[PDB]
């Protein structure tokens, strides 16, 4: 009773995805973004494709570059990907890693000088995620050891052992900050789903290479936090911001976060080997997936951005929700066997190919308006790396590979 797309469609999609990753995404990053003046990678590329070697450089972006090239190398073996990953790692370790207090600085000047020394848990997570993947790809012990130390700092300095979860920002010396906002866009609240999602993601990847008992407990406690506090069963959306006791302090809905958490939650529970908890996760995850399917999609299959605090639907197509839906809908299909999820995956991909992709300038447009008009946003900046789209492509290729083997 398996309803599965025929081999031709499965393979056709997988080839376009592979082509997109290697010939557009990873090609753009390998050639436009390496910086030969300060080493490492540029912190910004404007809409016209101009790299900015003197732009300030965020840890998150640089961790994302590291993760993506490391992941691509592990799965595809292209020596250039290791080389690019190595370039990212060296700069990262030299300049972003705080050798005195531990963890990674928020932002450095292009030459490497600390510019914003705060220790944000979101950035610490991406560091762990990236270092753990580099370790997976190469077996480097320093990367793993650095990954472990950052974990230790988060638990030591940020863990709320009364209420679950984490204080999200500290100063350089690991003293809690009042303002935990990632940006001006975020609510001034003590807890955010966004930051806790990436702790989970980081910890799940670290657990792959360091299956330590206490990490397992921390990982499971985050999954449990998501099921009991962040995921809303009545709506099928993640609540975005909370106080310290996880009381909702927000009503906005973010479709891209929903669909990302949908597959991440499952990956995390399966990394953990937690069979007793898996049914509840699969249920929350399929719900997240359906809710996005029902409420977050334009008629062309692409995802809207969010519903704001006042209820306003932002219809802009940002690059990363499309990427995350690609994986989230393929995952929902693998989990439930319902082919409507496959069709949704195909719809979003066609949108990516037809609208999101910047064919002229390479890579993907950050934002596309509801009328199909691309905004003249930066191609690369603090918040736009190769991770969402690079990962989405790697995941889809591997997931399609498994489906193909149903024959």
Ligand X SMILES: O=C[C@H](O)[C@@H](O)[C@H](O[C@@H]1O[C@H](CO)[C@@H](O)[C@H](O)[C@H]1O)[C@H](O)CO
Token pair of 332 as six digits: 């929902």
The one of ligand X, Cl ion, none whose footprint includes residue 194, by CB under 5 to 8 A per kind, is ligand X
Q: Which is nearer to ligand X, 10 or 170 (CB)?
A: 170
The one of Cl ion, ligand X, none whose footprint includes residue 119, by CB under 5 to 8 A per kind, is none
To the nearest whole angstrom, how small is the minimum distance from the Cβ of residue 260 to ligand X?
5
Helix (H, G, I), strand (E, B) or coil at 195: helix
The one of ligand X, Cl ion, none whose footprint includes residue 183, by CB under 5 to 8 A per kind, is ligand X
To the nearest whole angstrom, how small is the minimum distance from the Cβ of residue 54 to Cl ion?
22
The one of Cl ion, ligand X, none whose footprint includes residue 105, by CB under 5 to 8 A per kind, is none
Q: Which is nearer to ligand X, 332 or 403 (CB)?
A: 332
Binding mask 33-72 toward Cl ion (x if CB under 5 A, else -) reads -------------------------------x--------
Q: Which of 181, 222, 189, 192 has its CA nearest to residue 205? A: 222
The one of Cl ion, ligand X, none whose footprint includes residue 185, by CB under 5 to 8 A per kind, is ligand X
Find all residues with CB under 8 Å of 380, minimum gap 6, and list them. 32, 33, 42, 43, 44, 45, 51, 61, 363
Q: How far is residue 25's CA from residue 195's CA, in Å, rounded to a whole number?
A: 26
To the nearest whole angstrom, how small is the minimum distance from the Cβ of residue 147 to ligand X?
20
Find all residues with CB under 8 Å of 83, minimum gap 6, and list them. none
Q: Which is nearer to ligand X, 67 or 320 (CB)?
A: 320
To the nearest whole angstrom, how small is the minimum distance from the Cβ of residue 319 to ligand X?
8
Contact of 14 with 396, CB cutoff 8 Å: yes
CA 63 to mean position of chain CA atoms: 11
Binding mask 370-399 toward Cl ion (x if CB under 5 A, else -) reads ---------------x-xx-----------
Q: How far is residue 97's CA from residue 172's CA, in Å, rounded to a whole number?
A: 11
The one of Cl ion, ligand X, none whose footprint includes residue 357, by CB under 5 to 8 A per kind, is none
The one of Cl ion, ligand X, none whose footprint includes residue 287, by CB under 5 to 8 A per kind, is none
Q: Which is nearer to Cl ion, 296 or 385 (CB)?
A: 385
What burial class does residue 39 get, using C-beta atoms within 10 Å of its C-beta: 0-12 exposed, 13-18 middle, 19+ buried? middle
Q: Which is nearer to ligand X, 78 or 194 (CB)?
A: 194
Q: Which residues make up the interface to ligand X (CB under 6 A)?
A: 182-183, 185-186, 194, 257, 260, 320, 383-384
Contact of 288 with 231, CB cutoff 8 Å: yes
Q: Which of 145, 139, 146, 151 has its CA nearest to residue 70? A: 139
Q: Which is nearer to Cl ion, 306 or 363 (CB)?
A: 363
Distances (CA, A) of 139 to 43, 70, 74, 96, 394: 28, 11, 11, 21, 20
Q: Which is nearer to ligand X, 143 or 182 (CB)?
A: 182
Residue 357 binds to Cl ion (criterion: CB under 5 A): no
E strands, 142-253, are 169-170, 191-192, 231-232, 237-238, 241-242
Contact of 324 with 392, CB cutoff 8 Å: yes
Q: Which residues bind Cl ion (CB under 5 A)?
A: 64, 385, 387-388
């Amino acid at each position: 009773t398996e309803t599965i797309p025929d081999v031709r469609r499965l393979r056709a999609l997988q080839a376009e995805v592979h082509e997109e990753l290697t010939e557009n995404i990873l090609k753009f990053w390998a050639t436009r973004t390496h910086d030969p003046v300060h080493g490492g990678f540029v912190g910004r590329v404007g809409p016209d494709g101009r790299p900015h070697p003197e732009a300030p450089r965020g840890a998150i972006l640089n961790a994302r570059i590291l993760w993506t090239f490391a992941a691509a190398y592990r799965q595809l073996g292209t020596p250039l990907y290791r080389e690019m990953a190595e370039r990212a790692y060296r700069y990262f370790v030299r300049h972003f890693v705080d050798a005195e207090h531990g963890g990674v600085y928020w932002m450095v000047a292009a030459d490497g000088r600390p510019l914003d020394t705060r220790k944000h848990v979101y950035a610490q997570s991406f560091a762990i995620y990236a270092l753990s993947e580099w370790h997976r790809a190469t077996g480097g012990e320093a990367a793993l050891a650095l990954a472990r130390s950052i974990y230790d700092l988060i638990e030591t300095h940020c863990a709320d052992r009364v209420h679950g979860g984490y204080v999200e920002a500290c100063d350089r010396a690991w003293r809690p900050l009042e303002d935990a906002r990632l940006s001006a866009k975020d609510a001034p609240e003590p807890r955010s789903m966004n930051t806790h999602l990436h702790v989970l993601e980081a910890y799940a990847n670290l657990y792959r290479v360091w299956p330590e008992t206490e990490l397992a407990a921390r990982l499971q406690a985050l999954i449990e936090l998501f099921l009991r506090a962040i995921y809303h069963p009545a709506t099928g959306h993640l609540i975005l911001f909370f106080d310290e006791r996880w009381r909702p302090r927000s009503r906005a809905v973010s479709f891209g976060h929903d669909i990302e958490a949908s597959w991440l939650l499952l990956e995390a529970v399966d990394v953990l080997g937690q069979a007793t908890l898996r049914p509840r996760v699969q249920q929350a995850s399929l719900h997240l997936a359906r809710a996005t399917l029902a409420e977050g999609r334009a008629p062309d299959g692409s995802l809207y951005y969010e519903i704001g605090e006042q209820g306003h639907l932002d219809t802009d197509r940002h690059w990363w929700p499309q990427a995350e839906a690609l994986v989230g809908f393929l995952n929902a299909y693998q989990e439930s066997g319902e082919v409507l999820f496959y069709e949704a995956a195909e719809d979003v991909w066609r949108y990516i190919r037809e609208r999101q992709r910047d064919t002229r300038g390479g890579e993907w447009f950050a934002r596309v308006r509801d009328d199909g008009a691309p905004y003249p946003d930066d191609k690369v900046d603090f918040w736009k790396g190769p991770y969402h789209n690079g990962r989405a492509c790697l995941e889809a290729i591997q997931r399609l590979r498994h489906l193909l083997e149903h024959v």
